[PDB]
């Protein structure tokens, strides 16, 4: 009957080649590999909610929006009084590097950088503004702008 015992030993080694200890070994190795794969290189961008004043006079530099790949950066447009300024339309140059979500009524644009370091620009024609708002979108910076409050120079339809 020792044949039965040793055959069962070889049997249970073939059925479960990974020991209960080696199973936790493999699981830990897999989790470590996933952590290494999902770890960002260097310091992740600091998530900041900034506020800028948009000066539309000639000679002024268009505002910069710090984006990050796969992260949502929301621009809300406000007049000098801080009231919302609805968006009439927008024009996205190089829309293969940025994805913009915007319900057609509100004043908030939500841009997600599809590419790591490819930067571009954007035009935002507001409701009462003849002069479009020009912005430069730059991803892959040491800061990521979760929300930007763009204080346009004019006075919007809300006072």
């Amino acid at each position: 009957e020792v044949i039965d015992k040793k055959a069962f030993k070889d049997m249970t080694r073939n059925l479960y080649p990974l020991n209960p200890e080696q199973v936790v070994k493999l699981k830990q190795i897999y989790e470590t590999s996933e952590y290494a794969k999902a770890a960002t290189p260097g310091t992740p961008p600091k998530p900041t909610a900034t506020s800028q004043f948009v000066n539309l006079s000639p000679g002024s530099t268009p505002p910069v929006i710090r984006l990050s790949q796969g992260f949502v950066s929301s621009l809300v447009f406000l007049d000098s009084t801080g009231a919302p300024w609805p968006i009439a339309a927008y024009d996205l140059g190089d829309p293969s590097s940025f994805n913009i979500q915007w319900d057609k009524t509100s004043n908030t644009l939500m841009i997600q950088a599809t590419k790591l370091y490819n930067y571009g620009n954007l035009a935002v024609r507001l409701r009462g503004l003849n002069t479009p708002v020009m912005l430069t979108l730059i991803p892959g910076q040491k800061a990521v702008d979760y929300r930007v409050d763009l204080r346009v120079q004019g006075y919007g339809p809300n006072a």
Partner: peptide
């Protein structure tokens, strides 16, 4: 026994 670092760290012989 194996640690959460992926390296094996086992005791020699201990009976209770």
């Amino acid at each position: 026994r194996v640690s959460i670092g992926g390296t094996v760290y086992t005791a020699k012989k201990y009976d209770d």
